[PDB]
């Protein structure tokens, strides 16, 4: 498998996932200045900007590398926020809509 087409695919996939986050609540790191207790609960923060930096640093060399960090975005948000919040429901919606994006993108990776 060639590296360049794979990273092109991950870039497109990351763009499609970001499009599902219409409120852009996962676009940048959770601002630790506004939620000082966040690192009490969350062992590894994640967000789409960090994912883009990891992608371009060649830290994602298989689809699981990539999907694990996406899953962290979702799971961290479900963990930190109460069920009756916009943030929690946004993570549920992203899990649902993003899972479909990822399934198709992984099938294309497997054609490489
Ligand atoms: C995005 C965001 C901003 C401020 C506070 C919080 S608390 C949380 N959980 N997921 C995202 N966020 C935020």
Q: Are 70 and 102 in contact (CB under 8 A)?
A: yes
Give the distance (Å) from ligand 1 centre to CA of residue 32.
9
SS3 for the chain is CCHHHHHHHHHHHHHHHHHHCCCCCCCCCCCCCCCCCHHHHCCCCCCHHHHHHHHHCCCCCCHHHHHHHHHHHHHHHHHHCCCCCHHHHHHHHHHHHHHHHHHHHHHHHHCC
Token reading at 79: 């963990």
What is the CATH number that goes with domain 1-112? 1.20.920.10
* Interhelix angle 3-20/63-80, nearest 10 degrees: 20
Q: Is 109 in the pocket of ligand 1 (CB under 6 A)?
A: no
Domain boundaries, the chain: 1-112
- Ligand 1 atom with minimal separation from the 28 CA: 1
Q: How far apart are CA 52 and CA 65, in angstroms?
A: 13
Give the distance (Å) from ligand 1 centre to CA of residue 30.
5
Ligand 1: residue of 18, 87, 89, 93 to mutate (most ligand atoms within 8 A of CB) is 87
- The structure's method of determination equals X-ray
Q: Are 71 and 57 in contact (CB under 8 A)?
A: no
Q: How far apart are CA 88 and CA 80, in angstroms?
A: 8
Documented resolution in Å: 1.5
């Amino acid at each position: 498998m060639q590296l360049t087409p794979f990273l092109i695919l991950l870039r497109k996939t990351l763009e499609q996932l970001q499009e599902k986050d219409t409120g852009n609540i996962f676009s940048e790191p959770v601002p630790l200045s506004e939620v000082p207790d966040y690192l009490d609960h969350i062992k590894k923060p994640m967000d789409f900007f960090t994912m883009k930096q990891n992608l371009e640093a060649y830290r994602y060399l298989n689809f699981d590398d990539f999907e694990e960090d996406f899953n962290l975005i979702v799971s961290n948000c479900l963990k930190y926020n109460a069920k009756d919040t916009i943030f929690y429901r946004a993570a549920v919606r992203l899990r649902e809509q993003g899972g479909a994006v990822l399934r198709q993108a992984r099938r294309q990776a497997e054609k490489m």
